[model samples]
Target: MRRVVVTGLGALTPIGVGQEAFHKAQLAGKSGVRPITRFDASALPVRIAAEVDVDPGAYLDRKELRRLDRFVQYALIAAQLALEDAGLKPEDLDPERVGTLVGTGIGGMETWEAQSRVFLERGPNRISPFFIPMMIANMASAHIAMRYGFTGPSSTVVTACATGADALGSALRMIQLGEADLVLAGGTEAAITPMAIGAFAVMRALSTRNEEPEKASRPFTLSRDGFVMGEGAGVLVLEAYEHAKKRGARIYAELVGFGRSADAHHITEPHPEGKGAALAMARALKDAGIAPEQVGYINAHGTSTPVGDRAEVLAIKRVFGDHAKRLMVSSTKSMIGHLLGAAGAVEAIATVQALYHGVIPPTINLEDPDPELDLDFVPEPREAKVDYALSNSFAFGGHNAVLAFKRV
Candidate 1:
């Protein structure tokens, strides 16, 4: 078996556009929520979101930006940042030994909406020829590979919100199997459009507290309503431990374990007892060759939704037992809203930062903590030495995944 370590991390998140800036914002307890600015939201039920501030053109050429959708643009920028951070250039590594895996829940919805309007107003002939290329979910990974000339195994995972974690986990397996020496793994999302908001609003999955945007995403709080939509991208440079060491790579942490399972119970709702979710965590611990007591922090899949928050709490209790009470748990979603497929990747970065910095990012905006969700959630950022951490990501259709990392 091969050990895998994370060499570089990049983030274009709601709170910030780079790893250091993002971590600083988390430590400062900054909230990224604001009124929806991507489109006219006056007629929508939920009118707030955490949107990326910079234009893709700032990081890409005009023609390149026009050809790729916003989602792909986000992925490209994040991947470039990660590659630069890893101190690896395109000429430094063998193209055939590097792979790319990026995921998204709903790719290029904004482009699709625009194309649909064009088709309805004008004609099919007037539609842009780049519509299909930009709207497909797999293009996120394809674009990254094309940009860097990576030829190894390249694929996209689309397990809803769990897509990011699944992508990283799959990339880890690719390296472990000797299929690739370097894997660019992460996820990106840019669905903060009128259609996207309307759809989630109709399903009652978005928070309607338009008057209180900052407090709308209070995960594990008694007054929690629902998740606030967000958009961003996160990318990581993952390589085999021995390969990284041989090259004198700066290792941030070692990715030791990954676990996944399906609920088979509901389409949108999680299992009441969190049986499958707990199983995923337990399996990840076993894979890491560690006990529950070894984990010092947890980046939870707390989306601030009623059922989702409670179900994950149940799952933690089932898996950690008494250790759950001692561990510091927090939801970055409380500050940055929910990034859908990008959630896992960005949250994984946060977890690794926690271990590196020995500080727990707080689950901000918890006005009234839920009594049933009793745990040391690190309500506020605090200094605590941590060497091991776990990040959990559960998506729609009962997709559950977990990843464990230890300090290098």
Candidate 2:
């Protein structure tokens, strides 16, 4: 089997636009949560979000911008940036050998909401012809393939919040199995719409700290209420080790292993003991041929919700045992809120950065740590040499995905 490595990274987050900016923000412990500005969110209980401040016009032409949804636009832009960072283009490689597997949790809530309004207010005939293509979850991957002329395997994975990590895992399989030479794999999300906010709020899954937006996403903190919504995209260029070496590509990190599992316990809630979460992590470590004690850092799926946070901690403890106390675990969601499907991919990049730079990003807003969740949450960024790391993403429908990364 061929080895898979990350050759390039692209991040579009609320705290920053590119990989450099995102890395800088994470190290600085900057908070991206703020009052929602994309629309009038005053009437909602959860009014703040980590919304990305980007203009599609900057990356796409007018016609292209108008035709594609926000999620698709984000995926395309992130793919372009990843390709550029990898120093390769569609014209430079065999189009059939290059592929894309960009996933989105909720494809185009903004487009759906708008078209639904048009259908209700005006008429069904008034709905734009682009509505169907613009709203589907797979269109993001489709658009990336179309825009870049990547004719290889192109598909989207939708496992709720685990979509991004699973997408990368699937792409890794493609290269390892010799299906493709390279792939643009990651996830995007643009779900901060009225319907999405209202729906999640009704489910009591969002924080209601309207006055303290920056401090709302308090992962592993006793005062934590719920997760803060976020929107963005994270993409990476994955290439076979031999292919990258032949082209002299700058390898960021080696993607050694990936594991995914289902809780089979609940649709919305994780197992009380985090059985599936631990299984995924253990499988990933086994696949990587790395001992649990060898991992130095973990990008946890600590989404700040009470049950979610506790379950993840239990899962980590179950998998790592004594090593859990020594390993540094932090949630970037404390800084960027929960980016739904984009969380895993973005956190994966952050984990790779942590291994590459020998620095661990802080989990901000953790003023009062929960006594039950006792681990090094890293309230402030810390510099430490790390060889192996894990990025975890557990989502709704009992889905759990874990990726193991190694410093090159």
Candidate 3:
């Protein structure tokens, strides 16, 4: 398999808008969760989210902005940022050789809700012609490919919360198989609409810590309740090592390993013993040809839910044994909330940043850590030498994706 390296990163996260800001804010242990501002949530049990403060007009014209869904807008901007950071000019490369693998868990919820309202209140004919194009899950990757004329192997991976990491994993396969020399890979989500919040609330999948949004997502903590929803996009420029070397691109890290598995246990929960999660992690280590003790840090899929957090802990212990206690594990979700499909992509960026800077971002609101899930949770940002790391993403439907990174 051809070696793949990360050349650039773009993040439109709850805590920050770009890679620099996001990394800085993350190291500061800032929390982006707040009372729901995109819509009125007074009637819902859960009333807060980690919302990104962005103006679409900054990147797109009014007509362009109006034609796309919120999720697509985020993906478009993130792609542009990643390409720019990669220093890849449109005139310098063959458009056909560039591909995109962007993913989204729930697509265009805002558009669906609004158009459904129009169809019911007005008439079927009143619906906008762009409704279908705007609301589909694939539109994010479609728009990205269209924007840059990237015709090679463009596709969307939709594995719930694992969508982001899976997208990147798929991109790695494409490059390794000589399908494409370069691929824009990541995930995006803008599903903080009324229906999404209310639905998750009813399912008891969200934290109802209405009065304190920042403290709502306390992963691996005894006081933890559930995840806080967030909306954002994360994109990375992944290139074959030879291609990146020829272009003189700065590499952030080597994408050495990717492993995917399924729990096959339940639709909404992981296997009770974390069998699938452990399989994914162990497979990732094998793919990287690294020992369990070689991995220095893990960007955990710790979503703050009781069962999810516990399952992940069990998975880590199962895979690492005594080494689990020595690993620096932290969840960026503790600060930015769960970006769902975008979670893995953003956390992958965080993991790369951790390895690049040797700084482990803290899991804030960990005042009451769960004793059973004992590990170095990195309650405070700390600087240390980290050569190898892993980013774990487990989603609904028991999908698990893990990416292993080696410091560049």
Candidate 4:
């Protein structure tokens, strides 16, 4: 089997942007939650979110920004950064042998909301023909692929919160199967719109600790209420190990395993006993030939929700057994809020960086652990060395995805 390795990475997050920025934020324990600024969110119950701090104008020209939706812009910027960091350009590789894969929970939400309002107010003829292309979920992947002319195989995974991991998982399989030599894979999301917030709020899925936004997300804690919405994108340049080595590319980590499963139990809730999440983790470990003891850290799918955090803990323990107590598990969501579909991709980058740098970030705001959960969550930043780890992404409709990475 061909080994898939991550050659480059990019992060456009609420906490920070780019590789160095993300690393600093992780080490310094920065929090990105704050009041919404995209619109007047005062009318909404859940008014807080983690919005990207940098202006998109810094990367794209004024005229171009208006043509593309926020999600596509985020994807393009992240992809450019990853490609530049890898020192590889589109024309350098065979376009037919390259591909782009991106996952997003909601695509062009701002576009959708705006177009809907325009149609209702000015009739159907007033709607722009670009509405469908801009609002569709696959637009991010399509735009990236078209920009780079990567014709091998492209897809947009939409497994809710698990979209990012699923996207990367698909790219890994394509490379392993020799269907593509290099693939850009990740997730992007800009769903901090009024309608999106109102929908999740109506479902009672958002954290109501509005008074203290920084301390709102307490994963695996007794006070854990729910996840806070966030917006951003993360991209990685994944290449065949031999192709990367022949080109003298910098290898961040080896993508060893990808596992996916479904709970077949609920539409929005996870299995009460975490059966599906555990199965996916176990499968990934087996696929990577990594023993239970070999697993060192975990970037948990900890969205800080009441039932979700407890369920994930149960799944981890069932899969790791005795080593569960020692594994350095933590939630980056605690610091950056939940990025919905983009969570798995951004978290994957964080997990890979941990393996590359030998530092474990903290699950901030976890001052009080839930009685049902007890593990080394690395509640504070810690310096530790690990050879292998897993990043988990469990989503609605019982979708579960697990990606395993090891030191190169």
Clashes of each: 0, 0, 0, 0
401 Cα displacement, candidate 2 (Å): 0.4
Candidate 3 residue runs with Cα over 4 Å from true position: none
Tens digit of per-residue lDDT, candidate 3, span 85-116: 88987657788889899899999989999999
lDDT values, one for every candidate: 0.91, 0.92, 0.93, 0.90
> How does model 4 fare in lDDT?
0.90
Best by lDDT: 3
Where model 1 places Cα greater than 4 Å from the true spot, the runs are 123-125
Error (Å) of candidate 1 at residue 360 is 1.3
How good is model 2 by TM-score?
A: 0.98
Give stretches of model 2 more than 4 Å off: none
What lDDT score is found at residue 56 in candidate 2?
A: 81
> Residue 264 lDDT in model 1?
91
RMSD (Å) of each candidate, 1 decimal: 1.1, 1.0, 0.9, 1.1
Q: Can you give the lDDT of residue 114 in candidate 1?
A: 93
Error of 3 at 313 (Å): 0.5
Task: Return the TM-score for each candidate structure.
Answer: 0.98, 0.98, 0.99, 0.98
lDDT of 1 at 366: 78
Question: Mind giving the per-residue lDDT tens digits that candidate 1 earns over 64-180?
Answer: 786788999999999988988888889899999999999999999879999999999999999999999989999999999998899999999999989888898899899999999
Q: Decide which is better by TM-score, 1 or 3.
A: 3
Write model 2 residue lDDT over 1-408, tens digit each, in one string. 999999999899999998889999999899999999999987888899999998888888877788888999888878878888899878999999988998988899889999999999999999999999999999988888988888999988998889889999999999998899999999999999889999999989999999989999999999999999998999999999999999999988999989889999987888999999999999999989998999999999999999999999999999999989999999999999999988899999899888888899999988899999999999989999889999999998999999999999
